[model samples]
Target: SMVTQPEAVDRLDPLLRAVATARIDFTAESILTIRESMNQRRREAAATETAAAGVAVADDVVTGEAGRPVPVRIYRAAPTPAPVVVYCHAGGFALGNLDTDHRQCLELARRARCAVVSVDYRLAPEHPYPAALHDAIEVLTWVVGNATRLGFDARRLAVAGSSAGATLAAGLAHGAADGSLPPVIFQLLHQPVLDDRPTASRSEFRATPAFDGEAASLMWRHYLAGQTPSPESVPGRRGQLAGLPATLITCGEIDPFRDEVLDYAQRLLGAGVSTELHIFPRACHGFDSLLPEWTTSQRLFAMQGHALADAFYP
Candidate 1:
């Protein structure tokens, strides 16, 4: 039986209720408008805060597939020879930009004590599948090839992302493991969208807040554009994972993607890949972004920082 709405959400942290009530609508006409609104809100928040201290920030453009120029934001928390983490921002593959996850990249660099290269990949519903992924992979290649000039250690490379961005990160990790890309030592996925197929949580969270199953379906529709999702585009569709890097997978207990996150973590474990999983009970999707100042969010940051440090410093 499907879970009841109130009962399903009763355990959420108090700070998250407001986000649940302001759910997102990803229909064709509203997507662009919603993206603009979200971007504006993030820009406002960013304006209120001073530049991140102890972190050197810069922006650059790298050549992607077919020589397409891809923009990137770089954040360095430590001196040269530090580990590198390539980051992707969340937006269901149709929204967001370099500014969307500015705070997140800053946090990762500051906490992990590494250099983070944040990709501003092209969005879908126009660019479609392989565009964003190609951009991310290209940036990874660029970073590794120019490690000395970029002042980072490609030997200790990592990939990190949130929501749909996690999907890209997982795909990158898979490529690395299969010898198609540079090696990656760690993967940090937060509330990842791993599958386009149905799951128990997706069926249960039809109208849940921040993001829900309906929005998820629309998200895939926008990214896939009527085509079937292949193993290369969908990490969950891939059949093998034995050689993937160690991972940290975290998600909200009440999120629509919760089941897939757990399932993927278990699959990785079964395949002999080291994995760390965390489920924030009663939380909805994007809880960390919704209540970043909350104790739970703080704990999440600390955990991610510790994981990155462990992987890079050991």
Candidate 2:
């Protein structure tokens, strides 16, 4: 009748504890402010090192469409001209910069044997909707136009990011579907905040360990900044997605964005777009950055790097 075993119980205990300990109390606004402050501190801490390494870092800054100086951190893992991954950082469109995601960019540079260009796009609550999108599109355009100068094949370009940054990647891909934008080879989205509403996962995960639904709602509000949701702001709300590039979407099962990411992937598939979706169990949002101790996190990190490599190489 029952299949209970001591070994099974032992293995499942930690998972149960993780779920049981989860308490979703933090408001979205508070989480946004905290994350922004933390990101600012991280930027300050690395200011000197980032500047010192700038000379040897093999990077440059170009004026974005909005006239803001967008920092592009370039890294070369090999002597030959390798593929490029145009990367964006996650901060719910409110925080995050090159200084915040430097380590991951360098890792991609090494693993993918490609140049990683981390875009320092403008954030929200000040710049607001379409500002971030405008900056990202401009940076991507610049990358395509300047690939030869950057020493990479323009044809081997991919776009990638985590959380809100991944949301932008989706929008970028859709934006280019009309042939108005340059074709991107691949889109790598990690636990992307793709939807504007709470899905079944959010309801079932009232106490997701780190990424709470409440926090996600705040992120949407802050990123949107009282503006109405449109395809321009949330790519998931778009009606069509038939002509986008192949996508690689990864998510932790415990992450609040899991359902939205899955829903987007399904939509892409329904629209006849090639897509790959990976969901890791027992991991929370930002697990790649926050939970290196877990095996799933390590796999997720390696999987992303490998995906970039495959997308670029094959």
Candidate 3:
């Protein structure tokens, strides 16, 4: 039986009710509109004191496989030889840029006391599966190859992301473990969109909150664009979790992606991977982003910071 909304709604934080009422629209006409609006919002956020003090930021570009320039935002909170995190931004794959996760990168770098390189991977519906993945890989390779020049330690690398970006982060971890890319010491996934396949949570949260199952389906459709998704494109479809780096998976209790997030964490644990999982009750999808200054969001940031610090400093 599908979970009842009244029960889920009863658990929601009052601060999040307003956002939950305004669900994301992923219809054909609204998708691009929403993307533009979010881009504008992020731009405003970037301009209006999003970055943390003491963290130096720089914008640069890396060359991709096809010689295309992939833009990146570099955040340095610590000195040279510090651990580096390659970050992918949220947006369900078809939206967002470096600005989208500017504040998040700042928080990660500042709290973790490490450097963060935020990738501005190509979006989908125009550039599909391998394009975004290839861009992320290229950035990782570039970071490792020029770690000295970048003033970071490639030997203690980590990958992190939110929502769909987490899918890319997980994919990077897999590639690193397989020797296709440089090794990653840890992975941090927040409200990750790990699977394209149907799940009970997806069915239950079809129109629940900031991001629901309908949006999830549309997001995959846009990203896949009539093509089939392989294991490389969908992390949950991957059969092996062994050899992946230690992980921290965080998700909201009322999120459509909740079940998949928990399932992945369990699978990682079963495969003997060191995995820490947290479900923030009374929270919906994008809860951290929706109410970043709220106590719960602050807690999330602190947990992420602590995890990264332990991994990098260990």
Report the candidate with higher TM-score, 1 versus 2: 1
Instruction: Name the regions of candidate 1 deviating beyond 4 angstroms.
Output: 1-9, 47-53, 64-68
lDDT by residue for model 2 (69-171), tens:
7777776775545677778888778777776666566556776677777888887766778887777887788888987777778788788888888888877
Model 3, position 222: C-alpha lDDT score: 85
For 199-249, candidate 3 gives per-residue lDDT tens digits of 999988887767889889999998888778888889999998999999999
Give per-residue lDDT, candidate 1, residue 146: 97
Q: Give all candidates' CA lDDT scores.
A: 0.88, 0.72, 0.88
Per-residue alpha-carbon lDDT of candidate 1 for residues 218-281, written as tens digits (9 for 90 to 100): 9999999878888888899888889999999999888899999998999999999999999987
Q: Which ten residues in a row have the lowest lDDT in candidate 3?
A: 1-10
Model 3: residues with Cα > 4 Å off, grouped in runs: 1-9, 50-52
Ranking by lDDT: 3, 1, 2
